[PDB]
Short mmCIF file of C-alpha atoms and ligand atoms in Angstrom, two decimals:
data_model
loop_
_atom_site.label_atom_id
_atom_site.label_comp_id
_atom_site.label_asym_id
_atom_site.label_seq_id
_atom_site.Cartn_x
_atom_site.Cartn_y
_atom_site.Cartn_z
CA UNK A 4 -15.94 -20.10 -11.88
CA UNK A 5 -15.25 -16.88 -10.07
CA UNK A 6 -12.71 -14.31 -8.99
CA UNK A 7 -12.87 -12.32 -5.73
CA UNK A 8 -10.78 -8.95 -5.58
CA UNK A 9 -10.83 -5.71 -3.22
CA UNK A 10 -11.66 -2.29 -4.42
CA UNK A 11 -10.92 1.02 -2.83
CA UNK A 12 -12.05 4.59 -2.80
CA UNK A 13 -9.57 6.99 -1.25
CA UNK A 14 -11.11 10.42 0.01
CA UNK A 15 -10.08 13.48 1.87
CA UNK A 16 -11.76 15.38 5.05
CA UNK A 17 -10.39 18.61 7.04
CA UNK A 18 -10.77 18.36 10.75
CA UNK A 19 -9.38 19.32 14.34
CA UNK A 20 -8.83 17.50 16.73
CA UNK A 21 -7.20 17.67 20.25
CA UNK A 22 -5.66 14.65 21.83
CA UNK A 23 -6.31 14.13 25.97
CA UNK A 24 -8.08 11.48 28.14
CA UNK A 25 -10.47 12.75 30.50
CA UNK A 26 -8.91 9.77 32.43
CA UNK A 27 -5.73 11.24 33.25
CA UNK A 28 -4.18 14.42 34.68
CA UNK A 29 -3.36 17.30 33.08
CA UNK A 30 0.68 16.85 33.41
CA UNK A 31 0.58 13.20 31.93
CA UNK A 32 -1.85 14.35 29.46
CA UNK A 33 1.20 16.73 28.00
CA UNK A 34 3.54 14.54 28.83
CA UNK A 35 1.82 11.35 26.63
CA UNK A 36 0.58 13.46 23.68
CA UNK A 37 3.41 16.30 23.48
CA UNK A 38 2.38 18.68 21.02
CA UNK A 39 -1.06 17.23 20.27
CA UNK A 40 -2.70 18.18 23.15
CA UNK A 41 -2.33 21.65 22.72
CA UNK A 42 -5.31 23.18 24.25
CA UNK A 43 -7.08 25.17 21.34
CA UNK A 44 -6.41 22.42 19.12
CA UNK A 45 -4.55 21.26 16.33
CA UNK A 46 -5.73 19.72 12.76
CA UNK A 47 -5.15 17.67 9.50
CA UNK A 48 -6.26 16.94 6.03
CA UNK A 49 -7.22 13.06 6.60
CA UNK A 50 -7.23 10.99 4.04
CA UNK A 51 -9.09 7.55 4.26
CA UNK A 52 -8.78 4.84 1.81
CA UNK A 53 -11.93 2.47 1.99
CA UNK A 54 -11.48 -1.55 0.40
CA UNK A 55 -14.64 -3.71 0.11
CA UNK A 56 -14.02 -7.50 -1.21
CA UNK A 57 -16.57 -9.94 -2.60
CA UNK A 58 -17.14 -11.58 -5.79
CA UNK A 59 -16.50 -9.61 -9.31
CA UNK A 60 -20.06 -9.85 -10.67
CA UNK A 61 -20.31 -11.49 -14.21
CA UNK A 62 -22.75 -9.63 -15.24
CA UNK A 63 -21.42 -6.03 -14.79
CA UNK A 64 -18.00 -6.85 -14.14
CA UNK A 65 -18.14 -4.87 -10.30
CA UNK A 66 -17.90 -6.29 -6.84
CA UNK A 67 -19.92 -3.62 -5.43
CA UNK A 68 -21.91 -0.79 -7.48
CA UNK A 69 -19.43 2.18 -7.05
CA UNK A 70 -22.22 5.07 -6.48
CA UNK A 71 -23.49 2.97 -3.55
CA UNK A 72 -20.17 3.46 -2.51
CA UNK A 73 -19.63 6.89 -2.88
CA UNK A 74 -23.25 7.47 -1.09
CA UNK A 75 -21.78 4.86 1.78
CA UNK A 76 -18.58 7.14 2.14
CA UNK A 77 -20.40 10.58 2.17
CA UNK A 78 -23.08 9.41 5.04
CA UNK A 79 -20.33 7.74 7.13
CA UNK A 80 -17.14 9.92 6.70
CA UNK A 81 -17.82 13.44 5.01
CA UNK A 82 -21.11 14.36 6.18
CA UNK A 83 -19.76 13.06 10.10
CA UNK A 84 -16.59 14.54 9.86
CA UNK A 85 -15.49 17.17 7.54
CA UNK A 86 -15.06 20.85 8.40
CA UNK A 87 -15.70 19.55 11.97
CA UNK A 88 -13.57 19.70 15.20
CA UNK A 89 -13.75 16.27 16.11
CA UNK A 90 -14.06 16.33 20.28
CA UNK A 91 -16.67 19.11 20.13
CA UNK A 92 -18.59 18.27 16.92
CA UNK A 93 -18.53 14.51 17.13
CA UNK A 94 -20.63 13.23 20.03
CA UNK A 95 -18.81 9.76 19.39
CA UNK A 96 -15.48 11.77 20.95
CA UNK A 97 -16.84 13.33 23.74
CA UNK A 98 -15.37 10.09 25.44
CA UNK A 99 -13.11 8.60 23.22
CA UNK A 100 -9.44 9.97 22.66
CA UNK A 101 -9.40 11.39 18.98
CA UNK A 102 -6.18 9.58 17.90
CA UNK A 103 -5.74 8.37 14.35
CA UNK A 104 -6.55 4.63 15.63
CA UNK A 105 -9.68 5.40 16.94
CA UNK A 106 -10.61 7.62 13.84
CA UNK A 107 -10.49 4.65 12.10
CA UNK A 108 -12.32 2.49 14.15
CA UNK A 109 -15.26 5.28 14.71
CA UNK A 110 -15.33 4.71 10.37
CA UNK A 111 -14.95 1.29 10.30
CA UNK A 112 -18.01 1.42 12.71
CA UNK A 113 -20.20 3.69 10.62
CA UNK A 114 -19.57 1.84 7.39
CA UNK A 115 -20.79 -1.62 8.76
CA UNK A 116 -24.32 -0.08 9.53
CA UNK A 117 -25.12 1.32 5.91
CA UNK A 118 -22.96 -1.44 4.10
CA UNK A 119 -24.12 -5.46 3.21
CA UNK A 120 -22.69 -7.91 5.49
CA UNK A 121 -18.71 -9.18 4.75
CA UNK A 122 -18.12 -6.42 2.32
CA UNK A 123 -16.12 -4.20 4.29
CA UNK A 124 -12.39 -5.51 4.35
CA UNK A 125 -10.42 -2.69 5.24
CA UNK A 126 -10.21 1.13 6.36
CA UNK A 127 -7.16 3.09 6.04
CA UNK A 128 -6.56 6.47 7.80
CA UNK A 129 -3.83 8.53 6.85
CA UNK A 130 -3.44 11.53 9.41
CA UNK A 131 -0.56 12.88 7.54
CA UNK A 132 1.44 11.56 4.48
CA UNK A 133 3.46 9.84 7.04
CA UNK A 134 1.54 8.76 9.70
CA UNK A 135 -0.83 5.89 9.09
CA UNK A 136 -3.64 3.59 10.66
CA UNK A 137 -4.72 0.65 8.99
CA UNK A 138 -8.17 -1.29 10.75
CA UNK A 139 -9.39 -4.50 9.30
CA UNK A 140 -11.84 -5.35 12.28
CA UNK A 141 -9.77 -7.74 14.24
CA UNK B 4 15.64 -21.78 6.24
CA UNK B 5 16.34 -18.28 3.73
CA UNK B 6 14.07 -15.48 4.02
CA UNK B 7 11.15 -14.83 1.95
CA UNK B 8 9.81 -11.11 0.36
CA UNK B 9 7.67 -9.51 -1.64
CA UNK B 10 9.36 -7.42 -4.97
CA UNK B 11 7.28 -5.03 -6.95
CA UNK B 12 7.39 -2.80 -9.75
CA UNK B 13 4.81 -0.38 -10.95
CA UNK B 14 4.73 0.50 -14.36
CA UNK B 15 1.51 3.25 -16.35
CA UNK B 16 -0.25 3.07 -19.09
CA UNK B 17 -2.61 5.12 -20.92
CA UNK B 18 -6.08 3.94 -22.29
CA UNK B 19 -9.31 4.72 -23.37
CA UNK B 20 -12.83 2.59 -22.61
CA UNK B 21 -16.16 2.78 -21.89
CA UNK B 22 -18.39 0.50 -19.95
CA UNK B 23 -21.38 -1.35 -21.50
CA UNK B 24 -22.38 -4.74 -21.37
CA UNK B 25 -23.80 -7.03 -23.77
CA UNK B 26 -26.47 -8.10 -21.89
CA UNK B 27 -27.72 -4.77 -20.58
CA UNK B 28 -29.94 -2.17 -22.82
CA UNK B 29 -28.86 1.01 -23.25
CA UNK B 30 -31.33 2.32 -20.55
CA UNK B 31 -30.05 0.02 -18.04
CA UNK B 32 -26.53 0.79 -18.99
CA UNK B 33 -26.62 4.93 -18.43
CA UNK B 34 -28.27 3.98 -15.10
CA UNK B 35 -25.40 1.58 -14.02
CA UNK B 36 -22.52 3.29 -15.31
CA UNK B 37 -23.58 6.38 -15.65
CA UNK B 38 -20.90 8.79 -17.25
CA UNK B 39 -18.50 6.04 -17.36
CA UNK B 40 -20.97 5.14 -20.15
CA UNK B 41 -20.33 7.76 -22.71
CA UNK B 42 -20.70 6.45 -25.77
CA UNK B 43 -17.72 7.65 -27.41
CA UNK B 44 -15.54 6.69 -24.25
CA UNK B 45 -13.26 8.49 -21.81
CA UNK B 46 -9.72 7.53 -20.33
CA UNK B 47 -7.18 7.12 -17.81
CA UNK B 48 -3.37 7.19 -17.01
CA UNK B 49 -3.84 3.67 -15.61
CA UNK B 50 -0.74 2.40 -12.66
CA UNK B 51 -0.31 -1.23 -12.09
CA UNK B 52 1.84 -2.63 -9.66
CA UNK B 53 2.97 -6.50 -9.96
CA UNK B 54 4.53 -7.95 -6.99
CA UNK B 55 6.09 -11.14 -6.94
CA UNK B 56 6.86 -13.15 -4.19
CA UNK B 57 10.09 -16.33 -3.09
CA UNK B 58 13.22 -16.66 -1.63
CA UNK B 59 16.37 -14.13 -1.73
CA UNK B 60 18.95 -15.69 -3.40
CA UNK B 61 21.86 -16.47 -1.25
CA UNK B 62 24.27 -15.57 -3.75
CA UNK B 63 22.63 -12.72 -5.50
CA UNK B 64 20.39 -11.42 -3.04
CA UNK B 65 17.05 -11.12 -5.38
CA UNK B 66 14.06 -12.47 -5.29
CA UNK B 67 13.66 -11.88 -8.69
CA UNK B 68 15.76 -9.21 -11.01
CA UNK B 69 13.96 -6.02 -11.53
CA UNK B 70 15.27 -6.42 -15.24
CA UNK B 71 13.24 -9.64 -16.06
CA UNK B 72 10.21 -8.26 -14.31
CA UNK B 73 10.09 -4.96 -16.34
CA UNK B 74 10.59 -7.66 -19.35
CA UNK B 75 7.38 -9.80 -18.26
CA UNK B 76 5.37 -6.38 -17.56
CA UNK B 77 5.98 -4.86 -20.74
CA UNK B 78 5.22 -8.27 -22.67
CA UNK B 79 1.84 -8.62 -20.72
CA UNK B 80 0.96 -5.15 -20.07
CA UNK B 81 2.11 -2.20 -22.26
CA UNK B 82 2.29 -4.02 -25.35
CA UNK B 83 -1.40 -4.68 -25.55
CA UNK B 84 -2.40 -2.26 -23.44
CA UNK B 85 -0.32 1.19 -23.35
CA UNK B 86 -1.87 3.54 -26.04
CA UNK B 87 -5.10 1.31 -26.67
CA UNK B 88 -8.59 1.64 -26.78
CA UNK B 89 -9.68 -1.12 -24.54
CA UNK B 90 -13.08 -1.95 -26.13
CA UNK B 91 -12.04 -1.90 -29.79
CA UNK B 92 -8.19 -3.00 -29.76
CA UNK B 93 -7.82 -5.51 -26.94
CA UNK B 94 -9.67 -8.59 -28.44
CA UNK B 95 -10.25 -9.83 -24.80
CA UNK B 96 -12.76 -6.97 -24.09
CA UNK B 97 -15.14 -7.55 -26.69
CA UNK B 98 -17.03 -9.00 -24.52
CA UNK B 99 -15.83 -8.66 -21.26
CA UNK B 100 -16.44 -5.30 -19.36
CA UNK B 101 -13.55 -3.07 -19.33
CA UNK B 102 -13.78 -2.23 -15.54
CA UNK B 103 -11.24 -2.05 -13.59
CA UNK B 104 -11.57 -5.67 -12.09
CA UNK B 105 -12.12 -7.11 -15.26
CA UNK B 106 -8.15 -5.09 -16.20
CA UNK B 107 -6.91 -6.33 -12.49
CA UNK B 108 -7.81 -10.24 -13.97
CA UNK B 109 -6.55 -9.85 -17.56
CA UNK B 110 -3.25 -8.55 -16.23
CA UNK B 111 -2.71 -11.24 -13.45
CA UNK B 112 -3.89 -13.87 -16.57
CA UNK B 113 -1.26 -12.37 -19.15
CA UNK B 114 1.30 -12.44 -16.62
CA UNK B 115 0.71 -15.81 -15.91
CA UNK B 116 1.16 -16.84 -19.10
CA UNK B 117 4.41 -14.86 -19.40
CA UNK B 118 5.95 -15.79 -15.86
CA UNK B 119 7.70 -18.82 -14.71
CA UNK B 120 4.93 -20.57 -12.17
CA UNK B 121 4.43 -19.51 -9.13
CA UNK B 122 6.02 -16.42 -8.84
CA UNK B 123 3.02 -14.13 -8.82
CA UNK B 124 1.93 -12.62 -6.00
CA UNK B 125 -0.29 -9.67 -6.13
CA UNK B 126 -1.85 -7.62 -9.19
CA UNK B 127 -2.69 -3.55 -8.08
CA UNK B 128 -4.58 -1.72 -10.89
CA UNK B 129 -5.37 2.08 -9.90
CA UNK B 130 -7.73 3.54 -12.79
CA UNK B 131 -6.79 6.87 -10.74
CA UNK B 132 -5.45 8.11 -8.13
CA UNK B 133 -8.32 7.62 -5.96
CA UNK B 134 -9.79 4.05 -7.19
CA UNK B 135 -7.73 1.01 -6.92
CA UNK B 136 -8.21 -2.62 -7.54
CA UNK B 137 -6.16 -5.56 -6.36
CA UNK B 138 -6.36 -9.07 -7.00
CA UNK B 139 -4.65 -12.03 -5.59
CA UNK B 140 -5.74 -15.27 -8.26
CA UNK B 141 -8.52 -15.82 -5.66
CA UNK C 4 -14.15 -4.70 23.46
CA UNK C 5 -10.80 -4.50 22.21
CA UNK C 6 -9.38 -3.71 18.55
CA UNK C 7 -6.29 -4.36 16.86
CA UNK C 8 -4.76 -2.07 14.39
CA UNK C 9 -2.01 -1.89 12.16
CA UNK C 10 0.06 1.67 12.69
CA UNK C 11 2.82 2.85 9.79
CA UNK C 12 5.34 5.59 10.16
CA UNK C 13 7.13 6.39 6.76
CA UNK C 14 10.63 8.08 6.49
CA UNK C 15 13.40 8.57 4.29
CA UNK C 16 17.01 8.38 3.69
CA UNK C 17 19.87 9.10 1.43
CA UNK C 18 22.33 5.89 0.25
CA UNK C 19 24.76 5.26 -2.15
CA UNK C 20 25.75 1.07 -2.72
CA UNK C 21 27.12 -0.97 -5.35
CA UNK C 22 25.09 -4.10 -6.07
CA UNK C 23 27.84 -7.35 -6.34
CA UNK C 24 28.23 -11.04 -5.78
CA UNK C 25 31.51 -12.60 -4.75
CA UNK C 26 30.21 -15.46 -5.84
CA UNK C 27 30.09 -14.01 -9.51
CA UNK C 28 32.89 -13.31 -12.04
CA UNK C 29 33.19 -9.44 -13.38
CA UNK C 30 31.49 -10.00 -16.40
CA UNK C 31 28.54 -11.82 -14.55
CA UNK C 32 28.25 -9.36 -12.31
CA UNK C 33 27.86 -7.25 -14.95
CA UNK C 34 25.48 -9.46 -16.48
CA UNK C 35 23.12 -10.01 -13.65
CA UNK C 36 23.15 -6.29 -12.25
CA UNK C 37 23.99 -4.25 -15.45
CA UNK C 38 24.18 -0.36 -14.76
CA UNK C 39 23.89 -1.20 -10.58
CA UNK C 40 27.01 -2.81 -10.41
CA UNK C 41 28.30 0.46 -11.92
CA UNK C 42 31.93 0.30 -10.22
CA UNK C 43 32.00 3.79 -8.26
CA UNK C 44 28.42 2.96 -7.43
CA UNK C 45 24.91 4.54 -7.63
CA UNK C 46 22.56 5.99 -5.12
CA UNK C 47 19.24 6.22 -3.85
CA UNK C 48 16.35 8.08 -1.42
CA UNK C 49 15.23 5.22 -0.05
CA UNK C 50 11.67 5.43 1.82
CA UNK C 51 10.86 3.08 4.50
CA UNK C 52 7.41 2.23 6.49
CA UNK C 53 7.45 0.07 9.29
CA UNK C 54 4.38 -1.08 10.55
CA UNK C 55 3.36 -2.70 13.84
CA UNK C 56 0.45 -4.18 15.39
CA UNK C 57 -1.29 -4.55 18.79
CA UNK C 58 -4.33 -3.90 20.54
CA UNK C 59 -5.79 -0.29 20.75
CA UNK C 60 -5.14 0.53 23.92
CA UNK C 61 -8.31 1.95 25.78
CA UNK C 62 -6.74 4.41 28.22
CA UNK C 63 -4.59 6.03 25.54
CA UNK C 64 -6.29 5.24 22.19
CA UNK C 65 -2.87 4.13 20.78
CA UNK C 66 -0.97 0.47 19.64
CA UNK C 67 2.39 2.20 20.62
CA UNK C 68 3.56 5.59 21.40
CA UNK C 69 4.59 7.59 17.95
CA UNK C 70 7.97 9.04 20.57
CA UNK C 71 9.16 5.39 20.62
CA UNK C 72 8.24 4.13 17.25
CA UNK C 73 10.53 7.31 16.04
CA UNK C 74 13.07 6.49 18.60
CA UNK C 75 13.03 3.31 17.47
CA UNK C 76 13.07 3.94 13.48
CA UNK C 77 15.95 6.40 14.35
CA UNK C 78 18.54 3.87 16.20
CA UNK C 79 17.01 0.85 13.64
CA UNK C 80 17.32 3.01 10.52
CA UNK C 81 18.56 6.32 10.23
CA UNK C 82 22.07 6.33 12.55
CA UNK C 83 23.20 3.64 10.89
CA UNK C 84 22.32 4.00 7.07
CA UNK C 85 21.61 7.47 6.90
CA UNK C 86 23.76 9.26 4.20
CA UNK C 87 26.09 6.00 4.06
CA UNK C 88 27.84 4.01 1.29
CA UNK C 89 26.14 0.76 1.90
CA UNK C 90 29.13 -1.89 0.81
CA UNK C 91 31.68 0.47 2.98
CA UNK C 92 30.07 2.00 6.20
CA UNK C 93 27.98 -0.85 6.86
CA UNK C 94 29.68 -3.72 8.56
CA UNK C 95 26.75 -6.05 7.50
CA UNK C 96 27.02 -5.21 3.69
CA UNK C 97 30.42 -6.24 3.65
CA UNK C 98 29.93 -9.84 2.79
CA UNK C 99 25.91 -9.32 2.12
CA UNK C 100 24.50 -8.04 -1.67
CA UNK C 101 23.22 -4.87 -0.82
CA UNK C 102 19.77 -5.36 -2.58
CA UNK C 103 16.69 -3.92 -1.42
CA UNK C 104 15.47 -7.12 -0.23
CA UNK C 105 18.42 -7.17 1.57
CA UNK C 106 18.19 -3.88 3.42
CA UNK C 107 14.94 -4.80 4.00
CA UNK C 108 15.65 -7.63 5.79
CA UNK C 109 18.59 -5.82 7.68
CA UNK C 110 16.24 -3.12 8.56
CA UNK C 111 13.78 -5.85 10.29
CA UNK C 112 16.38 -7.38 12.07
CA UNK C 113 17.69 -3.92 13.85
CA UNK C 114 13.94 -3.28 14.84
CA UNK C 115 13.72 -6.70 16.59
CA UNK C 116 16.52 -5.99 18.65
CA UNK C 117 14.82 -2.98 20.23
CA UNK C 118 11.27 -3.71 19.84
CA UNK C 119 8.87 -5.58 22.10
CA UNK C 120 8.09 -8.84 21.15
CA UNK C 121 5.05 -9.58 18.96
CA UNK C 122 5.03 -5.84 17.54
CA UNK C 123 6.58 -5.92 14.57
CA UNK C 124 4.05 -6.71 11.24
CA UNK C 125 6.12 -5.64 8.24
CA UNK C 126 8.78 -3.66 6.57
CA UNK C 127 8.39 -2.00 3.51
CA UNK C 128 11.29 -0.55 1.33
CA UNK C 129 11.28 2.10 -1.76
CA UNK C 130 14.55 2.13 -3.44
CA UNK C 131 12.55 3.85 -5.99
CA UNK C 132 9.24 5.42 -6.13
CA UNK C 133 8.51 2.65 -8.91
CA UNK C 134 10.58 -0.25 -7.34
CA UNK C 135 9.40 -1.51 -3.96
CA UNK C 136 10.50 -3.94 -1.05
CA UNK C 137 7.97 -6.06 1.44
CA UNK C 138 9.67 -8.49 4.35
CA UNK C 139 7.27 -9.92 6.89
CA UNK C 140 9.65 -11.80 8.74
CA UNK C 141 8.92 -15.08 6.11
MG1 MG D 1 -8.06 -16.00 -13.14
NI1 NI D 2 -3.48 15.29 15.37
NI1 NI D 3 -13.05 4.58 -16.98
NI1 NI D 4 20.48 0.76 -6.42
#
């Protein structure tokens, strides 16, 4: 009887970030991350693209109530994130290299707590117009 | 065995709607839609892309000519659609809701009745720049 | 726990082609391809994202260093098509219809020459900003 389909909401946060490993030396930290591990920091306008999938609901013609998701997106990515400086803001980085891949994943990770199980199909991170990570949970 | 791809076009239209249901009072209506509910409507620059999927042609190195495809798309989508009010001029949404799902399905449908079988691949509706809808046939 | 992730890098560059078949007559040629079989040809800014896949590495918080996806994009992509008659400077057009399925497809080919094994996810090909190119390697 029924069709499924994928919706997305795409929003933008401004952040810093620096990229280094407290792992590794200070030489092969330049020498790995180049530019981005500039000491004071660099930053971006992110913009993350968020798809859900389920079942288009007969009734009001929605797979998922989009205020819900604009209340999901706000607690997990804008309130977290924007006008922040990721390492020192973000307690999640204190350990965790800030690179566009793990940005994703740290969203990925916040949406599953606030959203209903097998909703969440993808998260899309775009640290530049050019430079993109795509997570689906794998 | 020839290689297989995925060809798209993407195509706008213009459109107004509103979203109500039949089945909902006007109470519960304003709650779930909110200003998407305005009685006299509000609209969008909608963008669709169709992609169709098969086999390059040896000898002419398509999968399918971007001239017949713009010929399908404007049969199932801008002739009904382009310039429309959803709700009132689209027979099909009398009583269907005019979200963007419900568009996502009537497009993929039309098309299907427009396209040789088993060509279509993927229908992308964005309703703007920010909120996007794709559907498969699943 | 370990997390795979799709990562894109998008760039562009400037072509001029002719689309033919030697398997066609003039006048079909003209038929099938109309205005891009245009006999002193046409040109385009083609856009290309490549994605790969992998495993997030933990040390580094990256599928693949950016400096060799960009080395590899520039030996795959830009030396040889960049600001190129298709049909003429490229040996591979020369008996090959120089659709974008078919660059495409070339362009997935040159990255599997230089990239690891089990990297490459997909290939995706503007010609236009409104006519668009997937090859997965199908
Ligand atoms: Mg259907
Ligand atoms: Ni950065
Ligand atoms: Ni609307
Ligand atoms: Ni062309």
């Amino acid at each position: 009887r029924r069709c499924q389909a994928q919706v997305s909401r795409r929003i933008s946060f401004s952040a810093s970030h620096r990229l280094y490993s407290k792992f590794l030396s200070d030489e092969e930290n330049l020498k790995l991350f180049g530019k981005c591990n500039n000491p004071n920091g660099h930053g971006h306008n992110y913009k993350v693209v968020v798809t859900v999938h389920g079942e288009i609901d007969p009734a009001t013609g929605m797979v998922m109530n989009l205020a819900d998701l604009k209340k999901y997106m706000e607690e997990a990515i804008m309130q977290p994130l924007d006008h922040k400086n990721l390492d020192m803001d973000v307690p999640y980085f204190a350990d965790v290299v800030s690179t566009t891949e793990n940005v994703a994943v740290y969203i990925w990770d916040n949406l599953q707590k606030v959203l209903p199980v097998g909703v969440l199909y993808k998260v899309k991170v775009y640290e530049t117009d050019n430079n993109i990570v795509v997570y689906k949970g794998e």
